[PDB]
Amino acid sequence: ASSSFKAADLQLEMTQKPHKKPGPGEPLVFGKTFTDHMLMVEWNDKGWGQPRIQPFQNLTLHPASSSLHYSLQLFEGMKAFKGKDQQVRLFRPWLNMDRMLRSAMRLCLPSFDKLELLECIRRLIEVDKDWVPDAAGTSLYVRPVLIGNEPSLGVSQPRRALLFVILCPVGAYFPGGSVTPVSLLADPAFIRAWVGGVGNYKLGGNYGPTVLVQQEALKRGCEQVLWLYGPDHQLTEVGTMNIFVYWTHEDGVLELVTPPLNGVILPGVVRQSLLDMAQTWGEFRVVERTITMKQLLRALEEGRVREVFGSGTACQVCPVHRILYKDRNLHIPTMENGPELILRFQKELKEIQYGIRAHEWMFPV
Amino acid sequence: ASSSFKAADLQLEMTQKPHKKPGPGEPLVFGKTFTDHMLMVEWNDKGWGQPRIQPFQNLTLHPASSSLHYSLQLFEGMKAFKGKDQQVRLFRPWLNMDRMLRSAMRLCLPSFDKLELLECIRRLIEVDKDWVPDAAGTSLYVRPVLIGNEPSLGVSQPRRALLFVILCPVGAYFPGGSVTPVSLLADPAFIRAWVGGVGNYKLGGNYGPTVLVQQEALKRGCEQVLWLYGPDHQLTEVGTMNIFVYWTHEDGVLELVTPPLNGVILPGVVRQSLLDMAQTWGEFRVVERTITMKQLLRALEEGRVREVFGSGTACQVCPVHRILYKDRNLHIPTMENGPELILRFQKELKEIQYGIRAHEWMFPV
Ligand SMILES: *Cc1c(COP(=O)(O)O)cnc(C)c1O
Ligand SMILES: *Cc1c(COP(=O)(O)O)cnc(C)c1O
């Protein structure tokens, strides 16, 4: 936690051998193709070094690096979009910079200046501005990472750290413009996070354990995992996305609900953007309240449920049409009802993100 | 073939630039000084490559390596002792190989042959045999590591992996030529692991979150953290060691009790060795059973508690003399009572580990 680094001290080293761009008409799979440059800033005793943009390359880590033994690592994830006016913009970057600072502090990694980092990221995207796709639904995924880098096997606060950022072009989540549903496996046996735990931070350690559970879901015929918490089986998250339910509550009011930030939930940026956007329309009750399987099951049998979806940077708004709970199939009417609300959220985010409409959430590069 | 590498096709690359070995009259900070060679075996969609012993060097990782983003990493820890007779021996290596295989499978990493790996580690050690100290209480710490290494940001099973092993000389714990207690901070606010969680595996992800809590202990005036679990505040672990309590239980019987393996406890090798050793003496009741703070307090007031200690490879047997619970000091009579039992366990392990006495637990290098 020492005096930050300055974007003003940014050293830039253009690449010698530019990677071959993907090229229109080619399959863009999520996070598999990377741009030409990367950001890199190191930390140690005298504090931060000067930030540098340099050619994309491999990292040289000491075998005893704490990032590889004790998981002193955290990451972030956000997107940049290119509008028809050829301008590139980042979606509410400030929220990500804040989340990252908090995660850093939870792991005892060096704090830094949120705006300086933001500026450095803007310069990086500027350098690889040509990598940003402009098709439909495409964008640039930005991946900042901060890791401890102490060459010691002692479990302690790092005296050396490393912060880098890489970029990669990602195609439309829904090829064709049409949204498609996903089935979810809901099994109480699996717990991704506990209160007093660290599930409300974007730390590597929270995902490794989920790989096995995801395979278990696929084998059962489901695409994603619905994480349940507590004896009351309350819904918390879906895969790596926040969960929303559009229904008529028990009291007869039409509402949109998502679980509260009780500690076992990651504060999604898209999640916050949906609440804000919905609060603004003032067309129905928008609330943060606990949701349990029983409440869901009752609503389903009474036909009060309209749409259920997941939210996250990867898949802005993701429709859910089926849940496998206790070896029992629960069909969710999401698609037969539109999905009206989902389609609306989608259209509005698209106009804001692609510059069709001027908005303060967008950060120009 | 494919599914497992073999010691038989091990490739050797002796270093050609030896490092200066520490001197007996020097410090020896736990995981800070490393030997000349390391073991390395890679894996991919096909299968394992040939294992190789090579000069100690840095790792070259692709910036998108899943080991750095999703914590697909696990490790092990064991010791080798230079017997008085000049012979080097490993302490119950088989239990570590098993624990490692289980951890690998929990993270969807490649399985391997436990005995083949053991043989490779023996060769590694043999090669660096002269690095093993022969002072008093000194030994060689062996650190195997297995990490996912696929260059993709998708949260999924790795198609690439990397297994390496490094060695480092370590001196006797606490004072070196003595036994000294540690104070513990017991605060329910901190949860190390939960049932259905992954705390019973040696995965990097379980330690990163503990750094902050350890600092919080130091500022409170304690050397270690006592992890409590559940509304009933049951004792589970101490820092990175298993916990044992030596007392006269409610029923008037003298016993040694340690928490049961219910999921939130890492199956310690030393822990298992203490239970075995104690059961063999048949001098008192040796049991695995839940222990709660309340039970501990009542026994402290009636003066039924004799010794409380932690166990682990780093510190075979570690005395506890104080616990800070709810901003209240609880003095533990461990030292005033000898610690008779702690010293007995110590003496016996020393004779077995240093070859003074022939035993099946020791593995000759
Ligand atoms: C990234 C993430 C989210 C969603 O956050 P966004 O900022 O909206 O991308 C939700 N849950 C988990 C576990 C996540 O990792
Ligand atoms: C390594 C470890 C232990 C003790 O295991 P040993 O095999 O006896 O070294 C106990 N708890 C945790 C959390 C550990 O990491």
UniProtKB/Swiss-Prot annotation, chains A, B:
Gene Ontology BP term (one): lipid metabolic process
Identify which top EC class this enzyme belongs to. transferase
Swiss-Prot/TrEMBL keywords: Acetylation, Amino-acid biosynthesis, Aminotransferase, Branched-chain amino acid biosynthesis, Disease variant, Lipid metabolism, Mitochondrion, Pyridoxal phosphate, Transferase, Transit peptide
> Pfam families given for it?
Aminotran_4
| Listed PANTHER family | BRANCHED-CHAIN-AMINO-ACID AMINOTRANSFERASE, MITOCHONDRIAL (PTHR11825:SF39), SUBGROUP IIII AMINOTRANSFERASE (PTHR11825)
Under what name is this protein listed?
Branched-chain-amino-acid aminotransferase, mitochondrial
List the SUPFAM superfamilies.
Answer: D-aminoacid aminotransferase-like PLP-dependent enzymes
Where in or outside the cell it occurs: the entry states: Mitochondrion
Q: Which residues bind substrate?
A: Y141
Task: Please name the Gene3D superfamilies in this protein's record.
Answer: 3.30.470.10, D-amino Acid Aminotransferase, subunit A, domain 2
Q: Which organism is it from?
A: Homo sapiens
Q: What is its main location?
A: mitochondrion
Q: Which disease is it linked to?
A: Hypervalinemia and hyperleucine-isoleucinemia: An autosomal recessive metabolic disorder characterized by highly elevated plasma concentrations of valine and leucine/isoleucine. Affected individuals suffer from headache and mild memory impairment.
Functional summary from the UniProt entry = Catalyzes the first reaction in the catabolism of the essential branched chain amino acids leucine, isoleucine, and valine. May also function as a transporter of branched chain alpha-keto acids.
Q: How does it assemble?
A: Homodimer.
Q: Which cofactor does it need?
A: pyridoxal 5'-phosphate
Which family does the UniProt entry place this protein in?
Belongs to the class-IV pyridoxal-phosphate-dependent aminotransferase family.
Q: What is its EC number?
A: 2.6.1.42
- GO CC terms for this protein? mitochondrial matrix; mitochondrion; nucleoplasm
The catalysed reaction is: L-leucine + 2-oxoglutarate = 4-methyl-2-oxopentanoate + L-glutamate; L-isoleucine + 2-oxoglutarate = (S)-3-methyl-2-oxopentanoate + L-glutamate; L-valine + 2-oxoglutarate = 3-methyl-2-oxobutanoate + L-glutamate
N6-(pyridoxal phosphate)lysine sites (modified residues)? K202
Gene that this sequence comes from: BCAT2
**Protein's UniProt keywords contain ATP-binding:** no
Q: Which residues carry this modification: N6-acetyllysine?
A: K294
Q: Give tissue specificity per the record.
A: Ubiquitous.
A Gene Ontology molecular function term for this protein is: L-valine-2-oxoglutarate transaminase activity
